[PDB]
Chain A
């Protein structure tokens, strides 16, 4: 039947980056035509393969993603970029065969009085692994000895974005949908049309 790619984009709410959600879209008949025709995608940067070969190769099992970055963090969601949203928030592998889809939502997921409902992690021991989701809220400290929130050198591991609507084009809530194609030599479940 038709591939359930509509529910991935058209959703009531998206989780934050520190608690990003995924999908298990498999055994479908995809089209890859609702992404090229429209032009509301801010950054349509595919990696690994090209946008033309997506309609011919029979993938085994595709994986979707959903998170909201602080506008200027879409560049950090790339196979090789670093920063504060790509080392302890969402790590992308170098050999990433997928497509990054980001679009602006300065009117659907923003409030003139305040949109303090999205957070991100900025203090974690080491860096993350490709496609790792670390959902935790334990306090952070340079050394061990897990401390209390009231302390001298211990702080919270997450920080709220603080999206507004009276700011520049940089600080705007963007919804990023990272598709990850898994091309295993398995019985083809998701192919192109026709």
Chain B
């Protein structure tokens, strides 16, 4: 079956260039229109990025005229996108999609890739600051906890409770790009008042690009 495999994440700097590949397999990569779309977090996708892999035919959008340059390789069957002059408004997921028609015609996209999360900032490490289960705000038979994280740029991260034991109320809020330039996460959990103190409550941060794992008891 047709499947488009892409590369992984790629963090770049505000002013460098990004080169993301799109390997195609499962079909004849000779007569098929290839495209490239990008979805901003919360926003939508808006550009064509139509690349004709036959010899050299390309066509770009209006907002992306001299910033993007695409190319194809009939030997490896993989198209390449090169976006230069990365500003602070290009942090988004880049997709590569095929076409439903053949090379002369054009229609909607049918087979999509997997995405390429590209961001533009400086890397750092995380910091775990536990919240406080205030005994005064325990109305309703239950309580609340927290493992509020601090500024950290890379976000292939995750949290848990007792190494994944308790899975009731593991609501983990998405990160937010603070004014400093990094991200911050949050994770609370609701437990009965009768289980206060007896059951342990320790989160587990698994920030891989920082090699920092801090387990703090609330």
- Contact flag (A, B; Cβ within 8 A): yes
CB distance from A108 to the nearest CB of B (A): 28
How far, in angstroms, from A61 to B52 measured CA to CA in the complex? 10
Contact present for A130 and B57 (CB under 8 Å): no
Interface positions, chain B 50-64, Cβ under 8 Å from A, are 50, 52, 54-60
- Contact partner, A132, options B55, B58, B102, B106, Cβ 8 Å: B102
Closest to B31 in A: A131
Contact present for B101 and A130 (CB under 8 Å): yes
Closest to A129 in B: B101
Contacts A93-B105, A132-B102, A182-B104 given; indicate if A26 touches B55 (C-beta within 8 A): yes
- Interface residue? B5 (CB, 8 A): no
- Interface residue? A95 (CB, 8 A): yes
Contact present for B104 and A186 (CB under 8 Å): no
Contact present for A186 and B58 (CB under 8 Å): yes
Closest to A93 in B: B105
Contact present for A184 and B101 (CB under 8 Å): no
- Interface residue? B103 (CB, 8 A): yes
Closest to A183 in B: B59
- Interface residue? A194 (CB, 8 A): no
Contact present for A129 and B57 (CB under 8 Å): no
CB distance from A65 to the nearest CB of B (A): 10
- Interface residue? B100 (CB, 8 A): yes
Contact present for A129 and B103 (CB under 8 Å): no
Contacts A131-B105, A132-B102, A182-B104 given; indicate if A61 touches B60 (C-beta within 8 A): no
Contact present for A184 and B104 (CB under 8 Å): no
Contact present for B101 and A131 (CB under 8 Å): yes
- Interface residue? A114 (CB, 8 A): no
Residues on B with C-beta less than 8 A from A185 are 58-60
Interface positions, chain B 113-171, Cβ under 8 Å from A, are none
Contact present for B103 and A182 (CB under 8 Å): yes
Closest to B106 in A: A95
Contacts A60-B57, A61-B57 given; indicate if A184 touches B105 (C-beta within 8 A): no
Interface 1/0s, chain A 31-63, versus B by CB < 8 A? Answer: 000000000000000000000000000001101
How far, in angstroms, from A136 to B31 measured CA to CA in the complex? 18
How far, in angstroms, from A182 to B102 measured CA to CA in the complex? 11
Residues on B with C-beta less than 8 A from A26 are 55
How far, in angstroms, from A167 to B199 measured CA to CA in the complex? 95
Closest to B52 in A: A184
Give me 25 A-to-B residue pairs in the complex whose CB atoms sit less than 8 angstroms apart, sorted by A's number: A24-B54, A60-B52, A61-B52, A61-B54, A63-B104, A93-B105, A95-B106, A129-B102, A130-B102, A131-B101, A131-B102, A131-B104, A131-B105, A132-B102, A182-B52, A182-B57, A184-B57, A184-B58, A184-B59, A185-B59, A185-B60, A186-B52, A186-B56, A186-B57, A187-B56
Q: Given contacts A63-B103, A93-B104, A95-B105, list 5 more A-B pairs with CB under 8 A.
A: A61-B54, A131-B102, A180-B104, A182-B52, A186-B59
Closest 10 CB pairs of A and B: A131-B102, A180-B104, A130-B105, A185-B59, A93-B105, A186-B57, A184-B59, A184-B57, A130-B101, A60-B57
